[PDB]
Enzyme design. Structure first.
Site, PDB file in Angstrom:
ATOM      1  N   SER A 254      37.619 -16.911  -7.363  1.00  0.00           N
ATOM      2  CA  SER A 254      38.380 -15.762  -6.878  1.00  0.00           C
ATOM      3  C   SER A 254      39.462 -15.315  -7.877  1.00  0.00           C
ATOM      4  CB  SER A 254      39.005 -16.126  -5.526  1.00  0.00           C
ATOM      5  OG  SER A 254      39.713 -15.047  -4.947  1.00  0.00           O
ATOM      6  N   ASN A 255      40.269 -14.331  -7.480  1.00  0.00           N
ATOM      7  CA  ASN A 255      41.331 -13.787  -8.327  1.00  0.00           C
ATOM      8  C   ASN A 255      42.686 -14.446  -8.173  1.00  0.00           C
ATOM      9  OD1 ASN A 255      39.609 -11.949  -9.465  1.00  0.00           O
ATOM     10  ND2 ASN A 255      40.325 -10.222  -8.249  1.00  0.00           N
TER      11      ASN A 255
ATOM     12  N   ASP B  70      32.460 -15.712  -3.927  1.00  0.00           N
ATOM     13  CA  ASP B  70      33.647 -14.883  -4.105  1.00  0.00           C
ATOM     14  C   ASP B  70      34.401 -15.185  -2.807  1.00  0.00           C
ATOM     15  OD1 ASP B  70      34.732 -12.461  -5.878  1.00  0.00           O
ATOM     16  OD2 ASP B  70      35.190 -12.172  -3.668  1.00  0.00           O
ATOM     17  N   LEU B  71      35.717 -15.044  -2.800  1.00  0.00           N
ATOM     18  CA  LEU B  71      36.487 -15.346  -1.601  1.00  0.00           C
ATOM     19  C   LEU B  71      36.683 -14.183  -0.620  1.00  0.00           C
ATOM     20  CD1 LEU B  71      38.069 -17.696  -0.270  1.00  0.00           C
ATOM     21  CD2 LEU B  71      40.084 -16.725  -1.350  1.00  0.00           C
ATOM     22  N   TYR B  72      37.556 -13.246  -0.983  1.00  0.00           N
ATOM     23  CA  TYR B  72      37.895 -12.090  -0.148  1.00  0.00           C
ATOM     24  C   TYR B  72      36.757 -11.095   0.037  1.00  0.00           C
ATOM     25  CZ  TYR B  72      42.611 -13.815  -1.283  1.00  0.00           C
ATOM     26  OH  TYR B  72      43.721 -14.618  -1.464  1.00  0.00           O
TER      27      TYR B  72
ATOM     28  N   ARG C 121      43.693  -1.678  -1.419  1.00  0.00           N
ATOM     29  CA  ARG C 121      42.522  -2.415  -1.879  1.00  0.00           C
ATOM     30  C   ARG C 121      41.958  -1.776  -3.142  1.00  0.00           C
ATOM     31  NH1 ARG C 121      38.718  -5.854  -1.233  1.00  0.00           N
ATOM     32  NH2 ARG C 121      37.529  -6.614   0.576  1.00  0.00           N
TER      33      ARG C 121
END
Lengths: 220, 220
Positions: free
Chosen positions: B116-117, B8-10, B39
């Site tokens: 990621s998104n 996942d990135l963030y 968030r």
């Protein structure tokens, strides 16, 4: 135009603030903290389980959400306290205007229904406890469709149960995310905003924004 | 057994804490408050829009979530500040162990992917900015499937893009709700728990719970 009204239960007709107190009695000084998190996790778990297609009933989701809250806060939650806090939802009190407003709406020949998350038996206990059971044509649970709002399968249930097209059913909810779902579905939507909240930013706006059920009565 | 890793990135590889600061600069003293809500709304909007089948890309969901946060707090948010805060996500810094850990994993012949998104272009900007672009075989966005996690269509994307069966792909995520989805899907799951959080109560448990990417390297 509107011949029926679908109401959300917890937070719309019945005040959940009483749970805060029962929480503070169990964990003195922690009440507000526990309730805020508990309520949030209940929500998230209904949405997340729906997206994963891993349905469990609301009683289950409620226990899981309390179990998490307690582990997260460091509180020791035994079975007894677990049941007691969970039972706090069956003894909620309606908002002051609710009883009289419901009487008035029924007197106007409107079909009234409740579409909530809990079992039909739990929904019944809450309304019966307040002596308002005779005021509803239908007491609906999302359980039969095995998914939660805002999944459209839930909204179709209300349309079917009431025997009216969605355009003739007024959807009344306190939760802006729920009012957003109903609006996309096709229900003329009434958002009950008692405490000055702002609407969700998901591309919708309710047809009516009122401060209580009193304004609903005045619509007819 | 594992031949690939999906990250996942963030929050997993890149620290989002820097956004707090850029938020406090825009609204002195409000930073932490604004970021916490921002968030949360980003999350809710991805889940809710998925359930309603009303998809919009992550950049959109991010703006909508900031617009809401600002209205909710009473802050006056002009277009300029809107863009600037939203751009804070393209300049994140990786966690200290990340760079070296990635190097080591690649040296072991593992296929590495990010799911990621954000757009592939935004994901690229973040990794390239940190000089880590050469470390990934695939940079994946949920956009092609028009839905967000934990919807299974998203997880199938990683399986397809990597060209491996799910049982041979290690799913690494910081978000317990995400690790829960991946686990139900079939991915051997590694939960990165740096700050002492407790796992979600949705019927799952990760295969491995580590405190950083260092423990991931030591698994091979």
């Amino acid at each position: 135009y509107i011949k029926g009204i679908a109401f959300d239960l917890y937070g719309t007709l019945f005040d959940v603030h009483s749970v805060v107190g029962r929480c503070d009695e169990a964990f003195p000084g922690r009440g507000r903290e526990i309730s805020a998190l508990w309520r949030q996790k209940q929500l998230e778990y209904t949405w997340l389980r729906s997206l994963m297609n891993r349905y469990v009933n609301f009683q289950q989701a409620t226990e899981d959400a309390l179990r998490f809250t307690c582990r997260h806060l460091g509180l020791d939650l035994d079975a007894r306290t677990r049941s007691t806090l969970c039972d706090a939802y069956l003894r909620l009190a309606p908002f002051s205007e609710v009883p009289d407003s419901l009487r008035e709406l029924k007197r106007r020949g409107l079909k009234l229904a409740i579409l909530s998350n809990g079992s039909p038996q739990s929904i019944d206990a809450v309304v019966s406890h307040a002596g308002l059971r005779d005021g509803f044509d239908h007491l609906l649970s999302v359980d039969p469709v095995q998914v939660y709002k805002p999944d459209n399968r839930v909204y179709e249930l209300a349309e079917q149960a009431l025997g009216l097209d969605r355009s003739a059913i007024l959807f009344v909810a306190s939760n802006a995310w729920d009012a957003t779902g109903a609006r996309y579905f096709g229900f003329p939507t009434c958002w009950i905003n008692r405490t000055g909240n702002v609407f969700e930013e998901m591309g919708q706006t309710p047809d009516w924004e009122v401060t209580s059920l009193r304004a609903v009565v005045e619509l007819f």
